[PDB]
Amino acid sequence: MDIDPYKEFGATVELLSFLPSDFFPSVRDLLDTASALYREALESPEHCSPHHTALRQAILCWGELMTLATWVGVNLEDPASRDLVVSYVNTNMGLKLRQLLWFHISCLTFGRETVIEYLVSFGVWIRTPPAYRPPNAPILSTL
Amino acid sequence: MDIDPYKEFGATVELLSFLPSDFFPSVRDLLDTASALYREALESPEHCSPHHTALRQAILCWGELMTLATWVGVNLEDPASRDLVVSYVNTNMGLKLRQLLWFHISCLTFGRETVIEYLVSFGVWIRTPPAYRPPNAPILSTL
Amino acid sequence: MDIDPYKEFGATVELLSFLPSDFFPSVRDLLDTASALYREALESPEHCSPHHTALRQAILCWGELMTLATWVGVNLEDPASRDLVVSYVNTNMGLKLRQLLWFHISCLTFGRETVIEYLVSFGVWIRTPPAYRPPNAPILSTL
Amino acid sequence: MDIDPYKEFGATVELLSFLPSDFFPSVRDLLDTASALYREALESPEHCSPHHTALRQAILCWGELMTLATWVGVNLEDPASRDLVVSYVNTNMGLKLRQLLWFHISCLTFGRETVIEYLVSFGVWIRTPPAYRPPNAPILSTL
Protein backbone atom coordinates (compact mmCIF):
# COMPACT_ATOMS: atom_id res chain seq x y z
CA MET A 1 0.00 0.00 0.00
CA ASP A 2 0.90 3.66 -0.50
CA ILE A 3 -0.13 5.52 2.66
CA ASP A 4 0.65 9.18 3.22
CA PRO A 5 0.41 9.85 6.96
CA TYR A 6 -0.71 13.44 6.39
CA LYS A 7 -3.28 12.79 3.63
CA GLU A 8 -5.84 12.58 6.33
CA PHE A 9 -5.48 15.92 8.13
CA GLY A 10 -5.48 17.69 4.75
CA ALA A 11 -1.74 17.77 4.09
CA THR A 12 0.87 15.75 2.21
CA VAL A 13 4.47 14.66 2.44
CA GLU A 14 5.22 17.09 -0.37
CA LEU A 15 3.71 20.08 1.46
CA LEU A 16 5.85 19.38 4.53
CA SER A 17 8.86 19.24 2.21
CA PHE A 18 8.42 23.01 1.98
CA LEU A 19 10.06 23.08 5.40
CA PRO A 20 13.75 22.13 5.27
CA SER A 21 14.78 19.08 7.23
CA ASP A 22 16.90 21.12 9.66
CA PHE A 23 13.84 23.23 10.50
CA PHE A 24 12.28 20.64 12.74
CA PRO A 25 13.11 20.59 16.46
CA SER A 26 14.75 17.68 18.18
CA VAL A 27 12.65 14.72 19.26
CA ARG A 28 13.48 15.52 22.89
CA ASP A 29 12.16 19.08 22.59
CA LEU A 30 9.03 17.93 20.75
CA LEU A 31 8.26 15.18 23.27
CA ASP A 32 8.76 17.70 26.07
CA THR A 33 6.25 20.02 24.40
CA ALA A 34 3.82 17.11 24.00
CA SER A 35 4.15 16.18 27.67
CA ALA A 36 3.83 19.80 28.77
CA LEU A 37 0.67 20.52 26.82
CA TYR A 38 -1.17 17.22 26.20
CA ARG A 39 0.08 14.53 28.60
CA GLU A 40 -3.26 13.79 30.25
CA ALA A 41 -5.17 13.72 26.96
CA LEU A 42 -2.54 11.50 25.34
CA GLU A 43 -2.65 9.09 28.31
CA SER A 44 -6.46 9.19 28.29
CA PRO A 45 -8.80 6.37 27.23
CA GLU A 46 -10.71 8.73 24.91
CA HIS A 47 -10.34 9.18 21.17
CA CYS A 48 -9.81 12.86 21.74
CA SER A 49 -8.90 13.52 18.10
CA PRO A 50 -7.23 11.83 15.12
CA HIS A 51 -4.23 14.03 15.89
CA HIS A 52 -4.11 12.59 19.40
CA THR A 53 -4.31 9.03 18.06
CA ALA A 54 -1.53 9.70 15.55
CA LEU A 55 0.68 11.43 18.12
CA ARG A 56 0.21 8.46 20.46
CA GLN A 57 1.34 6.07 17.73
CA ALA A 58 4.33 8.30 16.93
CA ILE A 59 5.47 8.53 20.55
CA LEU A 60 5.27 4.74 20.81
CA CYS A 61 7.19 4.25 17.56
CA TRP A 62 9.94 6.48 18.94
CA GLY A 63 9.91 4.62 22.25
CA GLU A 64 10.37 1.33 20.42
CA LEU A 65 13.25 2.76 18.40
CA MET A 66 14.85 3.82 21.69
CA THR A 67 14.32 0.35 23.12
CA LEU A 68 16.02 -0.97 19.99
CA ALA A 69 18.97 1.41 20.41
CA THR A 70 19.42 0.30 24.02
CA TRP A 71 19.11 -3.35 22.99
CA VAL A 72 21.77 -2.86 20.31
CA GLY A 73 24.09 -1.16 22.77
CA VAL A 74 23.71 -4.10 25.14
CA ASN A 75 23.63 -7.09 22.79
CA LEU A 76 25.98 -6.11 19.94
CA GLU A 77 29.71 -6.57 20.44
CA ASP A 78 31.15 -4.87 17.34
CA PRO A 79 31.35 -1.18 18.32
CA ALA A 80 31.37 -0.01 14.70
CA SER A 81 28.05 -1.74 14.03
CA ARG A 82 26.68 -0.71 17.43
CA ASP A 83 27.35 2.96 16.77
CA LEU A 84 26.33 2.92 13.11
CA VAL A 85 22.95 1.46 14.02
CA VAL A 86 22.50 3.78 17.01
CA SER A 87 23.26 6.88 14.95
CA TYR A 88 21.01 5.73 12.12
CA VAL A 89 18.11 5.10 14.51
CA ASN A 90 18.72 8.46 16.18
CA THR A 91 19.06 10.65 13.07
CA ASN A 92 17.61 9.11 9.91
CA MET A 93 14.39 7.84 11.49
CA GLY A 94 14.22 10.66 14.01
CA LEU A 95 13.83 13.06 11.10
CA LYS A 96 10.50 11.59 9.97
CA LEU A 97 9.34 11.07 13.54
CA ARG A 98 9.97 14.73 14.35
CA GLN A 99 8.18 15.80 11.18
CA LEU A 100 5.18 13.83 12.45
CA LEU A 101 5.46 15.04 16.04
CA TRP A 102 5.80 18.63 14.84
CA PHE A 103 2.82 18.45 12.51
CA HIS A 104 0.45 17.00 15.08
CA ILE A 105 1.65 19.06 18.06
CA SER A 106 1.36 22.24 15.99
CA CYS A 107 -2.09 21.30 14.70
CA LEU A 108 -3.33 20.65 18.23
CA THR A 109 -1.83 23.87 19.58
CA PHE A 110 -2.59 26.18 16.66
CA GLY A 111 -5.12 24.42 14.44
CA ARG A 112 -4.83 22.18 11.39
CA GLU A 113 -5.96 24.82 8.89
CA THR A 114 -3.64 27.39 10.46
CA VAL A 115 -0.73 24.95 10.18
CA ILE A 116 -1.46 24.22 6.53
CA GLU A 117 -1.51 27.94 5.78
CA TYR A 118 1.75 28.32 7.70
CA LEU A 119 3.21 25.59 5.48
CA VAL A 120 2.13 27.40 2.31
CA SER A 121 3.38 30.78 3.54
CA PHE A 122 6.72 29.39 4.70
CA GLY A 123 7.16 27.71 1.33
CA VAL A 124 6.71 31.14 -0.25
CA TRP A 125 9.25 32.64 2.16
CA ILE A 126 11.84 29.91 1.64
CA ARG A 127 11.53 29.80 -2.15
CA THR A 128 11.96 33.57 -2.22
CA PRO A 129 15.68 34.06 -2.91
CA PRO A 130 17.72 35.72 -0.16
CA ALA A 131 18.20 39.13 -1.79
CA TYR A 132 14.43 39.61 -1.65
CA ARG A 133 13.58 37.46 1.37
CA PRO A 134 12.25 39.33 4.40
CA PRO A 135 13.97 38.50 7.69
CA ASN A 136 10.65 38.02 9.49
CA ALA A 137 9.96 34.43 8.60
CA PRO A 138 6.44 33.08 9.09
CA ILE A 139 6.15 31.69 12.60
CA LEU A 140 3.28 29.93 14.36
CA SER A 141 1.93 31.96 17.26
CA THR A 142 -1.17 32.72 19.29
CA LEU A 143 -0.21 36.27 20.32
CA MET B 1 5.17 9.25 28.41
CA ASP B 2 3.16 6.22 29.56
CA ILE B 3 0.93 5.59 26.55
CA ASP B 4 -0.91 2.34 26.01
CA PRO B 5 -1.99 2.17 22.34
CA TYR B 6 -5.05 0.03 23.13
CA LYS B 7 -6.76 1.88 25.98
CA GLU B 8 -8.36 4.50 23.74
CA PHE B 9 -9.80 1.38 22.09
CA GLY B 10 -10.78 -0.22 25.40
CA ALA B 11 -8.02 -2.80 25.70
CA THR B 12 -4.51 -3.14 27.08
CA VAL B 13 -1.06 -4.50 26.38
CA GLU B 14 -1.86 -6.97 29.17
CA LEU B 15 -5.05 -8.18 27.50
CA LEU B 16 -3.21 -8.73 24.23
CA SER B 17 -0.50 -10.50 26.22
CA PHE B 18 -3.34 -12.76 27.36
CA LEU B 19 -3.31 -14.58 24.03
CA PRO B 20 -0.14 -16.53 23.27
CA SER B 21 2.45 -14.86 21.10
CA ASP B 22 2.29 -17.65 18.51
CA PHE B 23 -1.46 -17.19 18.01
CA PHE B 24 -0.98 -13.92 16.17
CA PRO B 25 -0.70 -14.15 12.38
CA SER B 26 2.44 -13.21 10.52
CA VAL B 27 3.16 -9.63 9.54
CA ARG B 28 3.03 -10.59 5.86
CA ASP B 29 -0.38 -12.22 6.26
CA LEU B 30 -1.76 -9.30 8.26
CA LEU B 31 -0.51 -6.70 5.79
CA ASP B 32 -1.96 -8.69 2.90
CA THR B 33 -5.26 -8.74 4.81
CA ALA B 34 -5.10 -5.01 5.52
CA SER B 35 -4.46 -4.34 1.84
CA ALA B 36 -7.14 -6.70 0.51
CA LEU B 37 -9.84 -5.40 2.83
CA TYR B 38 -9.07 -1.72 3.48
CA ARG B 39 -6.43 -0.43 1.05
CA GLU B 40 -8.71 2.15 -0.55
CA ALA B 41 -9.82 3.50 2.82
CA LEU B 42 -6.36 3.54 4.38
CA GLU B 43 -4.96 5.34 1.33
CA SER B 44 -7.85 7.80 1.39
CA PRO B 45 -7.82 11.35 2.80
CA GLU B 46 -10.55 10.69 5.35
CA HIS B 47 -10.52 10.08 9.10
CA CYS B 48 -12.47 6.93 8.50
CA SER B 49 -11.91 5.70 12.05
CA PRO B 50 -9.32 5.74 14.83
CA HIS B 51 -8.57 2.15 13.87
CA HIS B 52 -7.73 3.38 10.37
CA THR B 53 -5.53 6.18 11.73
CA ALA B 54 -3.67 3.79 14.05
CA LEU B 55 -3.33 1.24 11.23
CA ARG B 56 -1.84 3.76 8.80
CA GLN B 57 0.65 4.83 11.47
CA ALA B 58 1.66 1.26 12.28
CA ILE B 59 2.01 0.25 8.63
CA LEU B 60 4.35 3.19 8.10
CA CYS B 61 6.37 2.43 11.25
CA TRP B 62 6.85 -1.12 10.00
CA GLY B 63 7.86 0.25 6.62
CA GLU B 64 10.61 2.30 8.24
CA LEU B 65 11.70 -0.78 10.19
CA MET B 66 11.99 -2.77 6.96
CA THR B 67 13.95 0.13 5.50
CA LEU B 68 16.22 -0.13 8.54
CA ALA B 69 16.69 -3.84 7.86
CA THR B 70 17.72 -3.11 4.28
CA TRP B 71 20.03 -0.28 5.35
CA VAL B 72 21.71 -2.67 7.77
CA GLY B 73 22.11 -5.27 5.06
CA VAL B 74 23.95 -2.70 2.97
CA ASN B 75 25.91 -0.58 5.44
CA LEU B 76 26.94 -3.26 7.96
CA GLU B 77 29.94 -5.52 7.49
CA ASP B 78 29.57 -7.76 10.57
CA PRO B 79 27.21 -10.54 9.43
CA ALA B 80 26.55 -11.77 12.97
CA SER B 81 25.52 -8.29 14.08
CA ARG B 82 23.48 -7.75 10.92
CA ASP B 83 21.62 -11.01 11.51
CA LEU B 84 21.13 -10.07 15.16
CA VAL B 85 19.59 -6.69 14.33
CA VAL B 86 17.41 -8.11 11.55
CA SER B 87 16.18 -10.85 13.87
CA TYR B 88 15.41 -8.46 16.71
CA VAL B 89 13.39 -6.42 14.22
CA ASN B 90 11.54 -9.37 12.70
CA THR B 91 10.77 -11.03 16.04
CA ASN B 92 10.49 -8.61 18.97
CA MET B 93 9.22 -5.55 17.13
CA GLY B 94 7.34 -7.82 14.74
CA LEU B 95 5.33 -9.33 17.60
CA LYS B 96 4.17 -5.94 18.86
CA LEU B 97 3.39 -5.05 15.25
CA ARG B 98 1.28 -8.13 14.62
CA GLN B 99 -0.58 -7.77 17.90
CA LEU B 100 -1.45 -4.20 16.90
CA LEU B 101 -2.39 -5.08 13.33
CA TRP B 102 -4.41 -8.12 14.33
CA PHE B 103 -6.26 -5.98 16.85
CA HIS B 104 -7.16 -3.17 14.48
CA ILE B 105 -7.91 -5.32 11.42
CA SER B 106 -10.10 -7.57 13.57
CA CYS B 107 -11.87 -4.58 15.08
CA LEU B 108 -12.66 -3.19 11.63
CA THR B 109 -13.83 -6.61 10.49
CA PHE B 110 -15.88 -7.94 13.41
CA GLY B 111 -16.39 -5.21 16.00
CA ARG B 112 -14.14 -3.81 18.69
CA GLU B 113 -16.31 -5.27 21.43
CA THR B 114 -16.44 -8.65 19.71
CA VAL B 115 -12.64 -8.59 19.56
CA ILE B 116 -12.19 -7.70 23.22
CA GLU B 117 -14.66 -10.37 24.31
CA TYR B 118 -12.82 -12.79 22.02
CA LEU B 119 -9.50 -11.99 23.66
CA VAL B 120 -10.96 -12.65 27.10
CA SER B 121 -12.74 -15.84 26.01
CA PHE B 122 -9.78 -17.29 24.11
CA GLY B 123 -7.36 -16.60 26.94
CA VAL B 124 -9.64 -18.26 29.47
CA TRP B 125 -10.06 -21.14 27.00
CA ILE B 126 -6.35 -21.67 26.37
CA ARG B 127 -5.95 -21.68 30.14
CA THR B 128 -8.79 -24.10 30.92
CA PRO B 129 -7.82 -27.78 31.11
CA PRO B 130 -8.91 -29.64 27.98
CA ALA B 131 -11.28 -32.13 29.61
CA TYR B 132 -13.43 -29.24 30.89
CA ARG B 133 -13.56 -26.83 27.94
CA PRO B 134 -15.14 -26.89 24.48
CA PRO B 135 -12.78 -28.82 22.23
CA ASN B 136 -12.33 -26.35 19.37
CA ALA B 137 -10.27 -23.21 19.74
CA PRO B 138 -12.49 -20.11 19.40
CA ILE B 139 -12.40 -18.19 16.15
CA LEU B 140 -13.78 -15.00 14.66
CA SER B 141 -16.09 -15.32 11.67
CA THR B 142 -18.32 -13.20 9.43
CA LEU B 143 -20.21 -16.19 7.96
CA MET C 1 -13.92 -20.43 64.70
CA ASP C 2 -14.75 -22.99 61.99
CA ILE C 3 -15.26 -20.71 59.00
CA ASP C 4 -16.22 -21.89 55.53
CA PRO C 5 -15.03 -19.50 52.79
CA TYR C 6 -17.92 -20.28 50.41
CA LYS C 7 -20.86 -20.32 52.84
CA GLU C 8 -20.85 -16.54 52.49
CA PHE C 9 -21.33 -17.06 48.75
CA GLY C 10 -23.94 -19.80 48.82
CA ALA C 11 -21.55 -22.70 48.42
CA THR C 12 -19.58 -25.02 50.68
CA VAL C 13 -16.27 -26.85 50.92
CA GLU C 14 -18.27 -30.05 50.45
CA LEU C 15 -19.74 -28.82 47.17
CA LEU C 16 -16.37 -27.84 45.66
CA SER C 17 -14.71 -30.99 47.01
CA PHE C 18 -16.14 -33.01 44.12
CA LEU C 19 -14.14 -31.00 41.59
CA PRO C 20 -10.93 -32.95 40.92
CA SER C 21 -7.50 -31.42 41.18
CA ASP C 22 -6.89 -31.68 37.42
CA PHE C 23 -10.00 -29.54 36.89
CA PHE C 24 -8.44 -26.32 38.10
CA PRO C 25 -6.08 -24.13 36.10
CA SER C 26 -2.64 -23.39 37.43
CA VAL C 27 -2.13 -20.61 39.95
CA ARG C 28 -0.25 -18.59 37.33
CA ASP C 29 -3.05 -19.03 34.79
CA LEU C 30 -5.70 -18.02 37.33
CA LEU C 31 -3.71 -14.97 38.43
CA ASP C 32 -3.20 -13.93 34.81
CA THR C 33 -6.96 -14.30 34.32
CA ALA C 34 -7.65 -12.22 37.44
CA SER C 35 -5.33 -9.49 36.17
CA ALA C 36 -6.52 -9.50 32.54
CA LEU C 37 -10.21 -9.48 33.43
CA TYR C 38 -10.45 -7.45 36.66
CA ARG C 39 -7.19 -5.62 37.43
CA GLU C 40 -8.68 -2.13 37.30
CA ALA C 41 -11.34 -3.19 39.81
CA LEU C 42 -9.17 -5.31 42.10
CA GLU C 43 -6.69 -2.44 42.39
CA SER C 44 -9.41 0.12 43.01
CA PRO C 45 -10.50 1.73 46.29
CA GLU C 46 -14.09 0.56 45.81
CA HIS C 47 -15.82 -2.38 47.39
CA CYS C 48 -16.98 -3.75 44.08
CA SER C 49 -18.23 -7.07 45.43
CA PRO C 50 -17.51 -9.66 48.11
CA HIS C 51 -15.90 -11.71 45.35
CA HIS C 52 -13.48 -8.86 44.63
CA THR C 53 -12.68 -8.52 48.34
CA ALA C 54 -12.02 -12.25 48.70
CA LEU C 55 -9.96 -12.33 45.51
CA ARG C 56 -7.73 -9.52 46.78
CA GLN C 57 -7.19 -11.40 50.04
CA ALA C 58 -6.38 -14.65 48.24
CA ILE C 59 -3.95 -13.03 45.81
CA LEU C 60 -2.12 -11.35 48.67
CA CYS C 61 -2.02 -14.59 50.66
CA TRP C 62 -0.43 -16.34 47.69
CA GLY C 63 2.03 -13.48 47.35
CA GLU C 64 3.10 -14.05 50.93
CA LEU C 65 3.46 -17.80 50.41
CA MET C 66 5.69 -17.03 47.42
CA THR C 67 7.77 -14.69 49.57
CA LEU C 68 8.04 -17.67 51.92
CA ALA C 69 9.19 -19.98 49.13
CA THR C 70 11.87 -17.51 48.05
CA TRP C 71 12.95 -17.08 51.68
CA VAL C 72 13.23 -20.84 52.10
CA GLY C 73 15.29 -21.18 48.94
CA VAL C 74 17.64 -18.45 50.13
CA ASN C 75 17.88 -19.41 53.83
CA LEU C 76 17.70 -23.23 54.03
CA GLU C 77 20.92 -24.95 52.99
CA ASP C 78 19.40 -28.43 53.34
CA PRO C 79 18.19 -29.04 49.76
CA ALA C 80 15.88 -31.92 50.68
CA SER C 81 13.90 -29.91 53.23
CA ARG C 82 14.03 -26.80 51.04
CA ASP C 83 12.40 -28.66 48.15
CA LEU C 84 9.97 -30.44 50.47
CA VAL C 85 8.65 -27.12 51.76
CA VAL C 86 8.56 -25.52 48.31
CA SER C 87 6.61 -28.50 46.97
CA TYR C 88 4.16 -28.41 49.87
CA VAL C 89 3.54 -24.71 49.26
CA ASN C 90 3.12 -25.09 45.51
CA THR C 91 0.93 -28.24 45.59
CA ASN C 92 -1.07 -28.54 48.80
CA MET C 93 -1.60 -24.81 49.30
CA GLY C 94 -1.64 -24.06 45.60
CA LEU C 95 -4.62 -26.39 45.26
CA LYS C 96 -6.71 -24.51 47.81
CA LEU C 97 -5.69 -21.19 46.28
CA ARG C 98 -6.72 -22.50 42.85
CA GLN C 99 -10.07 -23.71 44.17
CA LEU C 100 -10.79 -20.29 45.69
CA LEU C 101 -9.49 -18.26 42.74
CA TRP C 102 -11.44 -20.38 40.27
CA PHE C 103 -14.58 -20.02 42.36
CA HIS C 104 -14.50 -16.24 42.63
CA ILE C 105 -13.26 -15.56 39.08
CA SER C 106 -15.96 -17.87 37.71
CA CYS C 107 -18.58 -16.19 39.87
CA LEU C 108 -17.66 -12.79 38.48
CA THR C 109 -17.60 -14.20 34.95
CA PHE C 110 -20.79 -16.27 34.86
CA GLY C 111 -22.97 -15.65 37.88
CA ARG C 112 -22.77 -17.05 41.39
CA GLU C 113 -26.02 -18.98 40.89
CA THR C 114 -24.76 -20.36 37.58
CA VAL C 115 -21.52 -21.51 39.20
CA ILE C 116 -23.45 -23.19 42.01
CA GLU C 117 -25.78 -25.02 39.61
CA TYR C 118 -22.75 -26.06 37.56
CA LEU C 119 -21.18 -27.48 40.72
CA VAL C 120 -24.34 -29.41 41.59
CA SER C 121 -24.41 -30.90 38.08
CA PHE C 122 -20.68 -31.62 38.05
CA GLY C 123 -20.99 -33.38 41.38
CA VAL C 124 -23.76 -35.57 40.02
CA TRP C 125 -21.56 -36.38 37.02
CA ILE C 126 -18.40 -37.11 39.01
CA ARG C 127 -20.21 -39.25 41.61
CA THR C 128 -21.50 -41.37 38.74
CA PRO C 129 -19.16 -44.27 37.97
CA PRO C 130 -17.73 -44.07 34.44
CA ALA C 131 -19.71 -46.96 32.96
CA TYR C 132 -22.96 -45.05 33.54
CA ARG C 133 -22.10 -41.44 32.69
CA PRO C 134 -21.35 -39.48 29.55
CA PRO C 135 -17.58 -39.39 29.08
CA ASN C 136 -17.37 -35.59 28.77
CA ALA C 137 -17.69 -33.59 31.96
CA PRO C 138 -20.17 -30.70 31.99
CA ILE C 139 -18.72 -27.41 30.80
CA LEU C 140 -18.94 -23.94 32.30
CA SER C 141 -17.91 -21.53 29.57
CA THR C 142 -18.65 -18.34 27.69
CA LEU C 143 -19.08 -20.49 24.57
CA MET D 1 -0.87 -7.01 40.33
CA ASP D 2 -0.21 -4.39 43.01
CA ILE D 3 -3.18 -4.73 45.35
CA ASP D 4 -3.30 -2.74 48.57
CA PRO D 5 -5.41 -4.69 51.11
CA TYR D 6 -6.69 -1.49 52.78
CA LYS D 7 -7.43 0.70 49.75
CA GLU D 8 -11.01 -0.55 49.46
CA PHE D 9 -11.24 0.22 53.19
CA GLY D 10 -10.00 3.81 53.03
CA ALA D 11 -6.49 3.13 54.26
CA THR D 12 -3.08 2.19 52.88
CA VAL D 13 0.03 0.25 53.76
CA GLU D 14 1.66 3.65 54.18
CA LEU D 15 -0.88 4.75 56.79
CA LEU D 16 -0.77 1.47 58.74
CA SER D 17 3.02 1.76 58.78
CA PHE D 18 2.46 4.70 61.12
CA LEU D 19 2.13 1.94 63.69
CA PRO D 20 5.27 0.02 64.64
CA SER D 21 5.46 -3.72 64.17
CA ASP D 22 5.62 -4.42 67.91
CA PHE D 23 2.38 -2.49 68.48
CA PHE D 24 0.06 -5.12 67.11
CA PRO D 25 -1.40 -7.72 69.48
CA SER D 26 -0.62 -11.39 69.14
CA VAL D 27 -2.46 -13.55 66.63
CA ARG D 28 -3.81 -15.56 69.58
CA ASP D 29 -5.25 -12.51 71.33
CA LEU D 30 -6.68 -11.19 68.06
CA LEU D 31 -8.34 -14.51 67.22
CA ASP D 32 -9.75 -14.77 70.74
CA THR D 33 -11.19 -11.26 70.33
CA ALA D 34 -12.62 -12.11 66.92
CA SER D 35 -14.26 -15.22 68.33
CA ALA D 36 -15.64 -13.62 71.49
CA LEU D 37 -17.19 -10.73 69.56
CA TYR D 38 -18.01 -11.81 65.97
CA ARG D 39 -17.94 -15.63 65.85
CA GLU D 40 -21.66 -15.87 65.09
CA ALA D 41 -21.39 -13.44 62.18
CA LEU D 42 -18.15 -14.92 60.84
CA GLU D 43 -19.53 -18.48 60.87
CA SER D 44 -22.63 -17.19 59.09
CA PRO D 45 -23.85 -17.48 55.46
CA GLU D 46 -24.28 -13.73 55.07
CA HIS D 47 -22.17 -10.93 53.67
CA CYS D 48 -22.38 -8.97 56.86
CA SER D 49 -19.70 -6.52 55.72
CA PRO D 50 -16.57 -6.33 53.56
CA HIS D 51 -14.64 -6.29 56.83
CA HIS D 52 -16.28 -9.58 57.81
CA THR D 53 -15.34 -11.07 54.44
CA ALA D 54 -11.72 -9.91 54.75
CA LEU D 55 -11.50 -11.11 58.35
CA ARG D 56 -12.76 -14.56 57.35
CA GLN D 57 -10.08 -14.75 54.68
CA ALA D 58 -7.34 -13.65 57.10
CA ILE D 59 -8.49 -16.19 59.69
CA LEU D 60 -8.30 -18.98 57.12
CA CYS D 61 -4.90 -17.81 55.86
CA TRP D 62 -3.59 -18.12 59.40
CA GLY D 63 -5.21 -21.52 59.75
CA GLU D 64 -3.37 -22.68 56.64
CA LEU D 65 -0.08 -21.25 57.94
CA MET D 66 -0.62 -23.25 61.14
CA THR D 67 -1.33 -26.36 59.08
CA LEU D 68 1.89 -25.78 57.15
CA ALA D 69 3.78 -25.41 60.44
CA THR D 70 2.38 -28.69 61.77
CA TRP D 71 3.14 -30.41 58.46
CA VAL D 72 6.70 -29.10 58.58
CA GLY D 73 7.09 -30.44 62.09
CA VAL D 74 5.87 -33.86 60.98
CA ASN D 75 7.54 -34.16 57.57
CA LEU D 76 10.89 -32.42 58.10
CA GLU D 77 13.43 -34.38 60.14
CA ASP D 78 16.20 -31.76 60.07
CA PRO D 79 15.45 -29.89 63.33
CA ALA D 80 17.37 -26.82 62.14
CA SER D 81 15.36 -26.32 58.97
CA ARG D 82 12.15 -27.25 60.76
CA ASP D 83 12.77 -24.59 63.39
CA LEU D 84 13.72 -21.95 60.82
CA VAL D 85 10.53 -22.51 58.84
CA VAL D 86 8.35 -22.60 61.96
CA SER D 87 9.87 -19.37 63.26
CA TYR D 88 9.47 -17.62 59.92
CA VAL D 89 5.84 -18.69 59.63
CA ASN D 90 4.99 -17.71 63.21
CA THR D 91 6.85 -14.37 63.18
CA ASN D 92 7.40 -12.78 59.77
CA MET D 93 4.09 -13.81 58.20
CA GLY D 94 2.33 -13.51 61.51
CA LEU D 95 3.20 -9.81 61.45
CA LYS D 96 1.21 -9.12 58.28
CA LEU D 97 -1.62 -11.34 59.41
CA ARG D 98 -1.92 -9.45 62.70
CA GLN D 99 -1.83 -6.11 60.89
CA LEU D 100 -4.78 -7.40 58.85
CA LEU D 101 -6.63 -8.94 61.81
CA TRP D 102 -6.14 -5.87 64.00
CA PHE D 103 -7.37 -3.59 61.24
CA HIS D 104 -10.54 -5.51 60.44
CA ILE D 105 -11.44 -6.37 64.05
CA SER D 106 -10.87 -2.77 65.11
CA CYS D 107 -13.02 -1.60 62.21
CA LEU D 108 -15.87 -3.96 63.11
CA THR D 109 -15.59 -2.87 66.75
CA PHE D 110 -15.07 0.90 66.53
CA GLY D 111 -15.75 2.19 63.03
CA ARG D 112 -13.55 2.32 59.96
CA GLU D 113 -13.48 6.11 60.18
CA THR D 114 -12.49 5.89 63.84
CA VAL D 115 -9.68 3.46 62.99
CA ILE D 116 -8.29 5.69 60.23
CA GLU D 117 -8.42 8.68 62.58
CA TYR D 118 -6.70 6.55 65.22
CA LEU D 119 -3.97 5.82 62.70
CA VAL D 120 -3.31 9.50 62.00
CA SER D 121 -3.38 10.25 65.74
CA PHE D 122 -0.92 7.46 66.55
CA GLY D 123 1.23 8.81 63.74
CA VAL D 124 1.29 12.16 65.52
CA TRP D 125 2.10 10.56 68.87
CA ILE D 126 4.89 8.35 67.50
CA ARG D 127 6.47 11.07 65.33
CA THR D 128 6.45 13.43 68.30
CA PRO D 129 9.90 13.61 69.92
CA PRO D 130 10.14 11.90 73.32
CA ALA D 131 10.60 14.99 75.49
CA TYR D 132 7.08 16.08 74.46
CA ARG D 133 5.46 12.72 73.74
CA PRO D 134 2.63 12.06 76.20
CA PRO D 135 2.92 8.76 78.08
CA ASN D 136 -0.70 8.02 77.23
CA ALA D 137 -0.30 6.56 73.76
CA PRO D 138 -3.57 6.79 71.83
CA ILE D 139 -5.90 3.85 72.33
CA LEU D 140 -9.23 2.79 70.89
CA SER D 141 -12.17 2.82 73.28
CA THR D 142 -15.96 2.63 73.23
CA LEU D 143 -16.80 4.54 76.41
Residue numbers in the entry:
A (entry chain D), B (entry chain C), C (entry chain B), D (entry chain A): 1 to 143
What do the study authors state?
The building block of the capsids are dimers of HBc, which consist of an N-terminal alpha-helical assembly domain and a largely unstructured C-terminal domain (CTD). Instead, most of the mutations with a secretion phenotype map to a hydrophobic pocket in the center of the spikes below the SS-bridge in the rigid part of the assembly domain.
Interestingly, in the absence of TX100, the side chain densities of Leu-97 in chains A and D (L97*) pointed towards the center of the spike similar as Phe-97 in “conformation 1” of wt HBc whereas the densities of Leu-97 in chains B and C pointed towards the side of the spike similar as Phe-97 in “conformation 2” of wt HBc.
